[PDB]
Design an enzyme around this catalytic site. Structure first.
Site, PDB file in Angstrom:
ATOM      1  N   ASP A  10       8.740  50.371  13.710  1.00  0.00           N
ATOM      2  CA  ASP A  10       8.773  49.698  11.676  1.00  0.00           C
ATOM      3  C   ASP A  10       9.557  49.632  11.153  1.00  0.00           C
ATOM      4  O   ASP A  10       9.828  50.944  10.502  1.00  0.00           O
ATOM      5  CB  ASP A  10       7.048  50.350  11.608  1.00  0.00           C
ATOM      6  CG  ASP A  10       6.990  49.568   9.931  1.00  0.00           C
ATOM      7  OD1 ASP A  10       7.255  48.501   9.952  1.00  0.00           O
ATOM      8  OD2 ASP A  10       6.217  50.656   9.400  1.00  0.00           O
ATOM      9  N   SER A  69      18.188  34.890   3.401  1.00  0.00           N
ATOM     10  CA  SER A  69      18.375  33.853   3.970  1.00  0.00           C
ATOM     11  C   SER A  69      19.407  32.592   2.854  1.00  0.00           C
ATOM     12  O   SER A  69      19.014  33.349   2.257  1.00  0.00           O
ATOM     13  CB  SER A  69      17.128  33.582   4.204  1.00  0.00           C
ATOM     14  OG  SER A  69      17.209  32.674   5.076  1.00  0.00           O
TER      15      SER A  69
END
Ligand code: RDJ
Ligand code: NA
Length: 330
Positions: A35, A199
């Site tokens: 994770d 992004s």
């Protein structure tokens, strides 16, 4: 040193991925969920409340010659999905894919929430976010990657998740055979303890690319792609009959649909998520409503590039002095 381990979907939907991990001496192999959005290595154990164990493999520290109680240390964690676990702490030898760390904190669960009990395939979590997020008190502990890092050939790990197939986690090297083209690296903020990046925009299907900054985390422990409501509405508007259902808890679509791809920007590069990756199948067995793999983040407080996005790429988690994040198509 390096390590290389195969990671395997737990089910036909790629809900999560498990990776075998050796703990203790002699080795006890547990299948852990790696994770990148958390920082605790915790396991089902001989200490876990018996009624909360249903099929998991357990770690038994009393059977490990290298286990030592980390006296006084406790831990307790809550995840974004509402799940939780807590317990006490041992140090032990932990190996992943041939890479060994001695003295790793192994957080032994005394209690786990129902979602953990109900998943027999996951024996615990191995956190790969920043050690600043580790929940051990009163002495915070380091992740496996931070204990490994000085020993590694390079201070990196890579995630290569499969679509309906096994993939790979590598530590200490970048497999140049595992991706196509070049890796585009992008800056990371550690301010919130995550692999947090920005992004450069998105496209829906064959549509024009929208240049827009989207700040989010690279999180292998989250199944879906959670993005701002504007972006998500733009995606699902291209699917006949798709809608947001408050009863189901997100966007659903007709199972008869063909989904468009979703592109996200990494600097000037583009990662394309095929439409099929965004199908998470019937909402209930036999239903003709299917659950979407792109969902709104508006009720989270962060955008999450979970497995739907990461599995479309070869992803480098560069843990140099200044951490960065690389993406390549594959
Ligand atoms: C190699 C893994 N290191 C840690 O988990 C240390 S906590 C941490 N917070 N920011 C950093 C640097 C990478 C900038 O490190
Ligand atoms: Na679900």
């Amino acid at each position: 040193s390096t390590g290389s381990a195969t990671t395997t979907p737990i089910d036909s939907l790629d809900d999560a991925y498990i990776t075998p991990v050796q703990i203790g001496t002699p080795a006890q192999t547990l299948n852990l969920d790696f994770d990148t959005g958390s920082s605790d290595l915790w396991v089902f154990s001989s200490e876990t409340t018996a009624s909360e164990v249903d099929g998991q493999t357990i770690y038994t520290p009393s059977k490990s010659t290298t286990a030592k109680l980390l006296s006084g240390a406790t831990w307790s964690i809550s995840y974004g999905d509402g799940s939780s676990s807590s317990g006490d702490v041992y140090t032990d030898t932990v190996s992943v894919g041939g890479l060994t760390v001695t003295g790793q904190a192994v957080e032994s669960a005394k209690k786990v929430s129902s979602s953990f009990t109900e998943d027999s395939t996951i024996d615990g979590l191995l956190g790969l976010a920043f050690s600043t997020l580790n929940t051990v008190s009163p002495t915070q502990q380091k992740t496996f990657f931070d204990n490994a890092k000085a020993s590694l050939d390079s201070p990196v790990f890579t995630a290569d998740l499969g679509y309906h197939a096994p993939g790979t986690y590598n530590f200490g090297f970048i497999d140049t055979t595992a991706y196509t083209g070049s890796i585009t690296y992008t800056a990371v903020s550690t301010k919130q303890g995550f692999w947090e990046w920005t992004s450069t925009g998105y496209a829906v299907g064959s549509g024009t690319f929208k240049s827009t900054s989207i700040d989010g985390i690279a999180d292998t422990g989250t199944t879906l792609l959670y993005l701002p409501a504007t972006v998500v509405s733009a995606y699902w508007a291209q699917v006949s009959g798709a809608k947001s259902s408050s009863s189901v808890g997100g966007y659903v679509f007709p199972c008869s649909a063909t989904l468009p791809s979703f592109t996200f920007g990494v600097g000037s590069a583009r990662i394309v998520i095929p439409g099929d990756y965004i199908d998470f199948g019937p909402i209930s067995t036999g239903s003709s409503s299917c659950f979407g793999g792109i969902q709104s983040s508006a009720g989270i407080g962060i955008n999450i590039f979970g497995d739907v996005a990461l599995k479309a790429a070869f992803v480098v988690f560069n843990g140099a002095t200044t951490p960065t994040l690389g993406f390549a198509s594959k």
